[PDB]
Design an enzyme around this catalytic site. Structure first.
Site, PDB file in Angstrom:
ATOM      1  N   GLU A   1     -10.153  41.157   5.502  1.00  0.00           N
ATOM      2  CA  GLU A   1      -9.847  42.065   5.755  1.00  0.00           C
ATOM      3  C   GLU A   1      -8.401  43.555   5.100  1.00  0.00           C
ATOM      4  OE1 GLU A   1      -8.227  40.876   9.499  1.00  0.00           O
ATOM      5  OE2 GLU A   1      -8.631  42.728  10.967  1.00  0.00           O
TER       6      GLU A   1
ATOM      7  N   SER B   1      -6.914  45.598  18.282  1.00  0.00           N
ATOM      8  CA  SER B   1      -5.912  44.652  20.033  1.00  0.00           C
ATOM      9  C   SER B   1      -4.702  44.419  19.665  1.00  0.00           C
ATOM     10  CB  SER B   1      -7.017  43.225  19.741  1.00  0.00           C
ATOM     11  OG  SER B   1      -8.023  43.328  19.429  1.00  0.00           O
TER      12      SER B   1
ATOM     13  N   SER C   1      -0.749  45.371  12.839  1.00  0.00           N
ATOM     14  CA  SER C   1      -1.156  45.006  11.882  1.00  0.00           C
ATOM     15  C   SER C   1       0.210  45.568  10.394  1.00  0.00           C
ATOM     16  CB  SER C   1      -2.568  44.493  10.967  1.00  0.00           C
ATOM     17  OG  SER C   1      -2.308  43.017  11.446  1.00  0.00           O
TER      18      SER C   1
ATOM     19  N   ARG D   1       0.554  42.719   3.500  1.00  0.00           N
ATOM     20  CA  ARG D   1       0.887  42.766   4.491  1.00  0.00           C
ATOM     21  C   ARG D   1       2.305  42.413   5.387  1.00  0.00           C
ATOM     22  NH1 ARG D   1       0.524  39.662  10.189  1.00  0.00           N
ATOM     23  NH2 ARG D   1      -0.603  41.013  11.655  1.00  0.00           N
TER      24      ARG D   1
HETATM   25  N1  LIG Z   1     -14.964  52.005  23.097  1.00  0.00           N
HETATM   26  C1  LIG Z   1     -13.748  51.095  23.853  1.00  0.00           C
HETATM   27  N2  LIG Z   1     -13.895  49.764  23.478  1.00  0.00           N
HETATM   28  C2  LIG Z   1     -12.718  49.286  23.898  1.00  0.00           C
HETATM   29  N3  LIG Z   1     -11.669  49.475  23.004  1.00  0.00           N
HETATM   30  C3  LIG Z   1     -11.133  50.724  22.507  1.00  0.00           C
HETATM   31  C4  LIG Z   1     -12.806  51.994  23.815  1.00  0.00           C
HETATM   32  N4  LIG Z   1     -12.438  53.332  22.109  1.00  0.00           N
HETATM   33  C5  LIG Z   1     -11.215  52.755  21.582  1.00  0.00           C
HETATM   34  N5  LIG Z   1     -10.630  52.145  21.950  1.00  0.00           N
HETATM   35  C6  LIG Z   1      -9.693  51.434  21.837  1.00  0.00           C
HETATM   36  O1  LIG Z   1      -9.163  50.256  20.408  1.00  0.00           O
HETATM   37  C7  LIG Z   1      -8.752  49.358  20.284  1.00  0.00           C
HETATM   38  C8  LIG Z   1      -9.340  48.360  19.841  1.00  0.00           C
HETATM   39  O2  LIG Z   1      -9.285  49.491  17.925  1.00  0.00           O
HETATM   40  P1  LIG Z   1     -10.194  48.265  16.499  1.00  0.00           P
HETATM   41  O3  LIG Z   1      -9.454  48.834  15.561  1.00  0.00           O
HETATM   42  O4  LIG Z   1     -11.594  48.050  16.935  1.00  0.00           O
HETATM   43  O5  LIG Z   1      -9.531  47.045  16.713  1.00  0.00           O
HETATM   44  P2  LIG Z   1     -10.159  45.427  16.275  1.00  0.00           P
HETATM   45  O6  LIG Z   1     -10.668  45.396  15.728  1.00  0.00           O
HETATM   46  O7  LIG Z   1     -11.966  45.669  17.169  1.00  0.00           O
HETATM   47  N6  LIG Z   1      -9.170  44.001  17.182  1.00  0.00           N
HETATM   48  P3  LIG Z   1      -8.151  43.531  16.032  1.00  0.00           P
HETATM   49  O8  LIG Z   1      -9.164  42.083  15.840  1.00  0.00           O
HETATM   50  O9  LIG Z   1      -6.990  43.311  16.269  1.00  0.00           O
HETATM   51  O10 LIG Z   1      -8.144  43.867  14.029  1.00  0.00           O
HETATM   52  C9  LIG Z   1      -8.759  48.557  21.512  1.00  0.00           C
HETATM   53  O11 LIG Z   1      -7.878  48.295  21.863  1.00  0.00           O
HETATM   54  C10 LIG Z   1      -8.316  50.213  22.328  1.00  0.00           C
HETATM   55  O12 LIG Z   1      -6.818  50.512  22.807  1.00  0.00           O
HETATM   56  C1  LIG Z   2      -5.553  40.716  15.176  1.00  0.00           C
HETATM   57  N1  LIG Z   2      -4.487  39.958  13.603  1.00  0.00           N
HETATM   58  C2  LIG Z   2      -3.276  39.999  14.409  1.00  0.00           C
HETATM   59  C3  LIG Z   2      -2.199  41.576  14.378  1.00  0.00           C
HETATM   60  C4  LIG Z   2      -1.043  40.928  15.213  1.00  0.00           C
HETATM   61  C5  LIG Z   2      -1.107  39.811  14.743  1.00  0.00           C
HETATM   62  C6  LIG Z   2       1.118  39.474  15.257  1.00  0.00           C
HETATM   63  C7  LIG Z   2       1.685  39.207  14.049  1.00  0.00           C
HETATM   64  O1  LIG Z   2       1.548  39.477  13.475  1.00  0.00           O
HETATM   65  N2  LIG Z   2       3.379  38.201  14.598  1.00  0.00           N
HETATM   66  C8  LIG Z   2       3.532  38.054  13.627  1.00  0.00           C
HETATM   67  C9  LIG Z   2       5.606  38.249  13.746  1.00  0.00           C
HETATM   68  N3  LIG Z   2       5.292  37.753  14.988  1.00  0.00           N
HETATM   69  C10 LIG Z   2       7.075  37.723  15.413  1.00  0.00           C
HETATM   70  C11 LIG Z   2       7.326  37.039  16.574  1.00  0.00           C
HETATM   71  C12 LIG Z   2       8.207  36.499  16.767  1.00  0.00           C
HETATM   72  C13 LIG Z   2       9.599  36.886  15.432  1.00  0.00           C
HETATM   73 CL1  LIG Z   2      10.859  36.045  15.720  1.00  0.00          CL
HETATM   74  N4  LIG Z   2       8.672  37.056  14.565  1.00  0.00           N
HETATM   75  N5  LIG Z   2       7.541  37.760  14.642  1.00  0.00           N
HETATM   76  C14 LIG Z   2       4.488  38.797  16.096  1.00  0.00           C
HETATM   77  C15 LIG Z   2       2.926  37.272  15.672  1.00  0.00           C
HETATM   78  C16 LIG Z   2      -1.169  38.522  14.626  1.00  0.00           C
HETATM   79  C17 LIG Z   2      -2.665  38.774  14.151  1.00  0.00           C
HETATM   80  S1  LIG Z   2      -4.959  41.056  12.315  1.00  0.00           S
HETATM   81  C18 LIG Z   2      -6.640  39.402  11.662  1.00  0.00           C
HETATM   82  O2  LIG Z   2      -3.442  40.029  11.095  1.00  0.00           O
HETATM   83  O3  LIG Z   2      -5.529  42.523  11.883  1.00  0.00           O
HETATM   84 MG   LIG Z   3      -9.720  45.715  13.340  1.00  0.00          MG
END
Ligand SMILES: Nc1ncnc2c1ncn2[C@@H]1O[C@H](COP(=O)(O)OP(=O)(O)NP(=O)(O)O)[C@@H](O)[C@H]1O
Ligand SMILES: CN(c1ccc(CC(=O)N2CCN(c3ccc(Cl)nn3)CC2)cc1)S(C)(=O)=O
Ligand SMILES: [Mg+2]
Ligand SMILES: Nc1ncnc2c1ncn2[C@@H]1O[C@H](COP(=O)(O)OP(=O)(O)NP(=O)(O)O)[C@@H](O)[C@H]1O
Ligand SMILES: CN(c1ccc(CC(=O)N2CCN(c3ccc(Cl)nn3)CC2)cc1)S(C)(=O)=O
Ligand SMILES: [Cl-]
Ligand SMILES: [Cl-]
Ligand SMILES: [Mg+2]
Lengths: 352, 352
Positions: free
Chosen positions: A121, A175, A178, A190
């Site tokens: 990623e 969702s 990052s 990251r």
């Molecule tokens: N058509 C849609 N359906 C759902 N969510 C949407 C849509 N358009 C915008 N969003 C927003 O976009 C977010 C998803 O963003 P996106 O960058 O595609 O993440 P993701 O890659 O699917 N998730 P991740 O696994 O965390 O990297 C959702 O949480 C919504 O806030």
């Molecule tokens: C989907 N993905 C992703 C996005 C967000 C997260 C959340 C995160 O990164 N955390 C690390 C840091 N956290 C804390 C919590 C308490 C304390 Cl005291 N300190 N740190 C929160 C959880 C994890 C995966 S991804 C693959 O990266 O795009």
């Molecule tokens: Mg994504």
């Protein structure tokens, strides 16, 4: 085989598709009918089934890629519908990234002889972002910011040059969130992440208002007043808190007025939608600011589909980052915000 | 006049009251009946009206303060009921802090001849915290931590020495969150703050579950499973994300499973309560960690009444800070967490 890059996220699948436009007479004859059917299906439709969409406005035209000229297309559909996509496939080298490249690996392998190549990623997002900025958006800037983001009579979208992009803080709002620190084309990390992201907005908004789509949640929020739900500094102090430079309008407690039952009984769904959007957006901006200060990076670029058709959140980020940083940080945005991983995956094709 | 220190917050009023215990025969005669009535009322009741509570377990006994010996008492009631408190007053030098010292200044002045002295929240919190740790909790440590916070068969509350407290990061979780960097007794600053605090927990929990008290919200959360509402790393990847050291159990998107209508229809109120608590607590811990890294401070003390009778949040902070910092940061807690501003206000009495 068709040249496709796929980013399978927790919520959406993003697909980049390169359509060659320099097909010769001999190449057209050698094209098998299924390939011709795929290309015609993808280029002659803008909705695919009930949930797939091609973002036509984002198409890069007459791109030279891997020594061919073609158009780069951008397509999205919900990860929940990936079974339909794979079933259509069963009735190619696939470069895939995102968590779903791992989770659905065995599913993609049900397509006979398909080679699935999982790509990281991070590599994909950085490579895709740098590539798209380098080729430009059909001659226009890929990167923009909001000029004079403090004054609304003047605040306007303006292009931003990323010709020497480093260093760069990339905030990927999907969702979850990052946060990446990009020091060179080959030196990036990251930094951290937060779980208060786009899925929190959509999930909480659905619970609180009963909305059934991202677009509906945004429409509600555009009509709401978040201060009906939030407790502001002036609700606690009667005005500004000058000693620490906190304006009366700053949110002291998100949803903090909802501890009072009479206020819960008068708040509208639109107000709750807007408070959810403001809460999530301000928290993202604040975490971005803290990471930028720690990383000693002053350019912060926001990507991911939380910001798709979401000007409220973009303008809130632009204003907040400028205001709370005393002008030291700049919020930057990209036209192809949701697609960089899919592009970066496609760019890994020559390795296989 | 009675010696009182008051912190009027957005949600709760905290009052510290010094009861002298070295009253001589002559001093008792010179005591006016209203004063005697106040002292008897406060020391012979533990509930005051319908919403006031004296936290008897926190009392400091046989304290020497301003050259008198006495007991220090700790009393709280909702800011919403301050009109009752002032009306009872109308039927003294008051050192007061918190936003309500400003907002309700004119109200306190309706008590004839009352002198109200507003004191800065920051000075009061730091002075009160340093003072209480210095006098000890009746010979026991005021400050504690959770030893081996990673292993639940071993995790236990243990005392922590703050004899040389500096530097210290103080995270004050009230309606919102303020984060302070304390370098010396006279050198401290507010680093930043967040609006995702105790009022967000209580307000969102009330909207989502219909709970009508902080204690009820905590009881619900103790019975819930936050993973019914949250989307975890393993929901996106199928397992850990090893490349960035993210365990499968980490929350990727708070409330992120609530984007699915069938999941919204099966989640319980207890699950939503626990997800709200986990979301707010993890965000506080993460912001605390980023501020600690930027400030180059490795001791992080959490105060404020969000953590009152809230062992779930304390243990989550202890575990999370240790885990995500690879053991570099330590979460610290104080027995008198909600009262330091009120004590610091009382300690300003000699200035007037
Ligand atoms: N058509 C849609 N359906 C759902 N969510 C949407 C849509 N358009 C915008 N969003 C927003 O976009 C977010 C998803 O963003 P996106 O960058 O595609 O993440 P993701 O890659 O699917 N998730 P991740 O696994 O965390 O990297 C959702 O949480 C919504 O806030
Ligand atoms: C989907 N993905 C992703 C996005 C967000 C997260 C959340 C995160 O990164 N955390 C690390 C840091 N956290 C804390 C919590 C308490 C304390 Cl005291 N300190 N740190 C929160 C959880 C994890 C995966 S991804 C693959 O990266 O795009
Ligand atoms: Mg994504
Ligand atoms: N009996 C209670 N009633 C209300 N909230 C409670 C109670 N007990 C604990 N809490 C929690 O404690 C929080 C208030 O903490 P507290 O430190 O007293 O803040 P405050 O000073 O009143 N607000 P602030 O203006 O932001 O400094 C609430 O948001 C709840 O999460
Ligand atoms: C009650 N109190 C209080 C507690 C918490 C707050 C909230 C805060 O401090 N904010 C400053 C930093 N913020 C942002 C937002 C976006 C960005 Cl990009 N950057 N920063 C968020 C708002 C304000 C008052 S108090 C008197 O301090 O105890
Ligand atoms: Cl692979
Ligand atoms: Cl004053
Ligand atoms: Mg307070």
């Amino acid at each position: 085989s068709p040249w496709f890059g796929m980013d399978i996220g927790g919520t959406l699948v993003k697909l980049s598709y390169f359509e060659p436009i320099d097909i010769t007479a001999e190449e057209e004859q050698e094209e098998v009918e299924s390939l011709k059917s795929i290309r015609k299906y993808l280029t002659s439709n803008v909705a695919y089934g009930s949930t797939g969409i091609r973002d036509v406005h984002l198409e890069l035209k007459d791109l030279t890629l891997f020594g061919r000229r073609g158009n780069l297309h951008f397509i999205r559909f919900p990860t929940q519908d990936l079974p339909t996509f794979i079933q259509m496939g069963r009735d190619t080298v696939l470069c895939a990234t995102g968590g779903g490249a791992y989770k659905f690996e065995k599913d993609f392998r049900t397509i006979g002889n398909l080679h699935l190549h999982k790509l990281d990623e991070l590599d994909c997002l950085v490579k895709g972002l740098l590539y798209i900025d380098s080729v430009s958006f059909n001659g226009q800037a890929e990167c923009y910011y909001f000029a004079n983001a403090s004054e609304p009579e003047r605040c306007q979208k303006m292009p931003f040059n990323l010709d020497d992009p480093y260093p760069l803080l990339v905030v990927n709002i999907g969702s979850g969130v990052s946060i990446l620190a990009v020091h060179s084309k080959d030196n990036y990390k990251r930094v951290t992440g937060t779980s208060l992201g786009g899925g929190t907005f959509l999930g909480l908004c659905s619970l609180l208002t009963g909305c059934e789509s991202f677009e509906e949640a945004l429409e509600m929020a555009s009509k709401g007043d978040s201060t009906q739900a939030d407790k502001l500094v002036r609700d606690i102090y009667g005005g500004d808190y000058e000693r620490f430079g906190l304006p009366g309008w700053a949110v002291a407690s998100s949803f903090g007025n909802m501890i009072y039952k009479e206020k819960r009984e008068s708040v509208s769904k639109e107000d709750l939608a807007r408070a959810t959007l403001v809460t999530i957006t301000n928290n993202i901006g604040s975490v971005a600011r803290m990471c930028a200060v720690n990383e000693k990076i002053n350019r912060v670029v926001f990507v991911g589909n939380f910001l798709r058709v979401n000007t409220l959140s973009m303008k809130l980020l632009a204003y907040a980052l400028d205001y709370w940083s005393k002008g030291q940080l700049k919020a930057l945005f990209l036209e192809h915000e949701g697609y960089f991983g899919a592009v970066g995956a496609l760019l890994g094709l020559p390795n296989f």
